[PDB]
């Protein structure tokens, strides 16, 4: 029925996609999430929106998802939509490995998912996914990498970026502090705490940090324990 | 599945969804193409952060060994059109055993765009494209496609934000003297861009494939 159809996949008179823009509004109200590239690894730092005292915490992470052996990601927006998309990312990665018997290069994984998101903006008359994702990974082509995708299916590579709440304020701090080509993981960690310190309105229970490194020709993805997240104490001295 | 007629006629013979698609093009970064004597040059505005990886966000892309294009508008829509064209270039090599002519692939891209203006359940593509390369006899070529699926060949052209101003500059500046050498052909593109503008530039020569210029080499011209 033409009466009830909200027409989610049309252009506005200015050549805008309203559903995409309203989806990006949703993301701006989601937990802060940032990623930083260094010379010896990549990291993701996320604000936990959980926060409640009576929560159980059954998983190893809440906002950081492993995608394959060499890749993880984090999300900002509708949680349920993120679950659909991250499942799909795992499927694409496995489909590539089946076919080529090598891991999917990071950009190829991002492009494949963005094609799905783009499709939702052009046909099918459905609402788009209200998710921005940060992807971290290593491949044999470009080494350590960081990507960001948004609801329209646009993506870009970054040395450092932020999505979610107060991301504009975060991107400002990154431009000032990020030493291009001179960042280690230890200094990147420091900068992450420093950025989350300003944008978040800090506790170890309120943040989640994952690092991606190479050890003996093999990728290691680990979520830092509460004790390691010592990093908050190291900043307050500065 | 979804079968709503999205692109329809309005009372004056207007196709509003196509016109709105053309507005999406105008929100895009400026792209300039100049056809020289024995060279074709593409140049694009880059708006970019310092923290961004330059390699990932490029508005100049190779379709085949002998064909490349630049775009303005929705970047996601562009990726879809580019990959469709890339598949088609291979299907042509398969069936005819020759590389695509610049005109053939243009015609293909244009008809794809046209179909999305007359198909149920779909909105038009919100990009214009500049398509460059050489034919078998070594003739340089520059074509433009737009959301309606119209295509034409140009000596020089611009698309995206402030395309009208750049076009009027090129009209007064596109002479024999300006395209007499390869250095002056590149210069004319940079001048055209500096009229509305941090710039990315690529050159294609006769049977020599696409070469993207370094930031240090672009800084010399500016």
């Amino acid at each position: 029925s033409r009466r009830y159809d909200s027409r989610t996949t049309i252009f506005s008179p200015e050549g805008r996609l309203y559903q995409v823009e309203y989806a990006m509004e949703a993301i701006g109200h989601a937990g802060t999430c940032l990623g930083i590239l260094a010379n010896d690894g990549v990291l993701l730092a996320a604000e936990r929106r959980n926060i409640h005292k009576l929560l159980d915490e059954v998983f190893f992470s809440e906002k950081i998802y492993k995608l394959n052996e060499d890749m993880a990601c984090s999300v900002a927006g509708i949680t349920s939509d993120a679950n659909v998309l991250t499942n799909e990312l795992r499927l694409i990665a496995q489909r590539y490995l089946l076919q080529y018997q090598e891991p999917i290069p990071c950009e190829q994984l991002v492009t494949a998912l963005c094609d799905i998101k783009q499709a939702y903006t052009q046909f099918g008359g459905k609402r788009p996914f209200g998710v921005s994702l940060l992807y971290i990974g290593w491949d044999k082509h470009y080494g350590f990498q960081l990507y960001q995708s948004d609801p329209s299916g646009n993506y870009g590579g970054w040395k450092a970026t932020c999505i979610g709440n107060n991301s504009a304020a975060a991107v400002s701090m990154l431009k000032q502090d990020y030493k291009e080509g001179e960042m280690t993981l230890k200094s990147a960690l420091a900068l992450a705490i420093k950025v989350l310190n300003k944008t978040m309105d800090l506790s170890a229970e309120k943040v989640e940090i994952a690092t991606l490194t190479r050890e003996n020709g093999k990728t290691v993805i680990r979520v830092l324990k509460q004790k390691e997240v010592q990093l908050i104490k190291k900043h307050e001295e500065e | 599945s979804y079968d709503r007629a999205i692109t329809v006629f309005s009372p004056d013979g207007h196709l509003f969804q196509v016109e709105y698609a053309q507005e999406a093009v105008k929100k895009g970064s400026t792209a300039v193409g100049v056809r020289g004597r024995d060279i074709v040059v593409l140049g694009v505005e880059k708006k970019v952060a310092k923290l961004q990886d330059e390699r990932t966000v490029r508005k100049i892309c190779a379709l085949d060994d002998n064909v490349c294009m630049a775009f303005a508008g929705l970047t996601a829509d562009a990726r879809i059109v580019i990959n469709r064209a890339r598949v088609e270039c291979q299907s042509h090599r398969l069936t005819v055993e020759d590389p695509v002519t610049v005109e053939y692939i243009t015609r293909y891209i244009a008809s794809l765009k046209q179909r999305y203006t007359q198909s149920n359940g779909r909105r038009p593509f919100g990009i214009s494209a500049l398509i460059v390369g050489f034919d078998f006899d070594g003739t340089p070529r520059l074509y433009q496609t737009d959301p309606s699926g119209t295509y034409h060949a140009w000596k020089a052209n611009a698309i995206g934000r402030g395309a009208k101003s750049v076009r009027e500059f090129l009209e007064k500046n596109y002479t024999d003297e300006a395209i007499e050498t390869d250095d002056l052909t590149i210069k004319l593109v940079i001048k055209a861009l500096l009229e509305v503008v941090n710039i990315e530039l690529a050159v294609m020569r006769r049977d020599q494939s696409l070469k993207i210029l370094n930031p240090e080499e672009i800084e010399k011209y500016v």
């Binding site: 805008r16 996609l17 995409v20 823009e21 990006m24 948004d150 329209s152 646009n154 | 999406a24 929100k27 895009g28 970064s29 708006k47 966000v57 508005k59 303005a72 508008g73 929705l74 970047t75 996601a76």
Partner: peptide, 5 residues
Amino acid sequence: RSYYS
């Protein structure tokens, strides 16, 4: 906007 260029 962020999704053009």
